[PDB]
């Protein structure tokens, strides 16, 4: 809430006061204090479908794979994404896992939502969203989702919201061609939309016609490949690009339909989710498998 110049200077000086980097372990063990007592493994049927999860877009970086191929990757963080309730046919008329993520200051939280959070025995949450799933894939209330939910190399269906670009004309909003910059073109026509419909016969402008307006801010879905996961910080590195701002909410779920049939048919997945066994050691960082053939062959 400072002045513009103060915020600019603090942005400039941000780097000088970062915390020292943490020490990332190579292997970790999980005890009963981090495993929900009702979390148990299930073997899926044909109709079984797992739940998604919520993450925050953090940034993007370039990483080398085993062959030396460089991939641009987007880092997302599952910042305390916790199951808060279960939807059921008899109790709610449908089936889903309700998940809360983030932290909101209490002085910004409202009293009834504070009561909900107290009932859930969790800190105040920033956002809450549902994930529809099969009956056998329902997770117990209180379980905390981990990046280990996703096997590296798998395809994931990702949904988000695109950024806002403000008010834009047709040329910038839809890439209209406009007119020539010379040859007698009138000033109003250089970036005009031209004609906008047919003539007296139909006597309308058709719905969904492309015109100027406020650009951006739409729900956008894409596919990504799970490139890497780090369990210590609940970081997931996904190959490609993801809609939204840095710090914006992202839904991540298993690929479906054509993508699943073409990519995920043979990659085993944990059902309902990763179910740790107490006392067993697991790797902290996992990479996707390498390509069989040499990308630099030609």
């Amino acid at each position: 809430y400072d002045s513009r110049w103060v915020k600019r200077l603090d942005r400039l000086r941000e780097s000088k006061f970062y915390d020292p980097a943490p020490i990332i372990k190579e292997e970790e063990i999980l005890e009963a204090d981090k495993i929900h007592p009702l979390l148990k493994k299930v073997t899926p049927s044909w109709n079984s479908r797992r739940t998604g999860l919520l993450a925050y877009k953090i940034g993007m970086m370039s990483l080398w794979d085993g062959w030396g191929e460089r991939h641009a990757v987007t880092v997302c963080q599952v910042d305390r994404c916790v199951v808060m309730d279960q939807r059921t046919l008899d109790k709610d008329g449908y089936e889903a896992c309700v998940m809360g993520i983030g932290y909101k200051p209490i002085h910004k939280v409202t009293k009834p939502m504070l009561g909900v959070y107290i009932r859930s025995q969790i800190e105040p949450k920033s956002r809450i969203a549902e994930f529809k799933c099969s009956s056998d894939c329902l997770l117990p209330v209180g379980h905390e989702m981990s990046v280990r939910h996703f096997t590296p190399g798998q395809q994931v269906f990702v949904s988000g919201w695109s950024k806002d670009k403000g008010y834009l004309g047709v040329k910038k909003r839809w890439g209209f061609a406009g007119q020539n910059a010379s040859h007698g073109v009138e000033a109003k026509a250089h970036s005009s939309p031209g004609s906008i419909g047919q003539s007296k016969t139909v006597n309308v402008v058709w719905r969904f016609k492309k015109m100027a307006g406020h650009a951006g801010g739409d729900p956008r879905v894409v596919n990504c490949k799970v490139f890497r996961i780090e369990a210590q910080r609940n970081l997931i590195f996904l190959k490609g690009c993801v809609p939204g701002y840095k710090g914006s909410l992202i839904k991540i779920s298993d690929a479906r339909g054509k993508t699943h049939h073409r990519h995920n048919r043979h990659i085993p997945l944990h059902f309902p989710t990763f179910v740790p066994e107490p006392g067993v050691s697991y790797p902290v960082t996992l990479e996707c498998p390498d390509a069989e053939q040499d990308p630099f062959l030609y």
Binding site: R207, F208, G217, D218, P219
Partner: peptide, 29 residues
């Protein structure tokens, strides 16, 4: 003059969501 066909403008499936379409759905609710 010769012109490109631009048959992609006739696409009817896989169209991205737009504010116009969402407003249409809201109206039809």
């Amino acid at each position: 003059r010769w012109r490109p066909k631009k048959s992609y403008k006739k696409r009817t499936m896989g169209l991205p969501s737009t504010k116009a379409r969402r407003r249409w759905a809201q109206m039809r609710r």
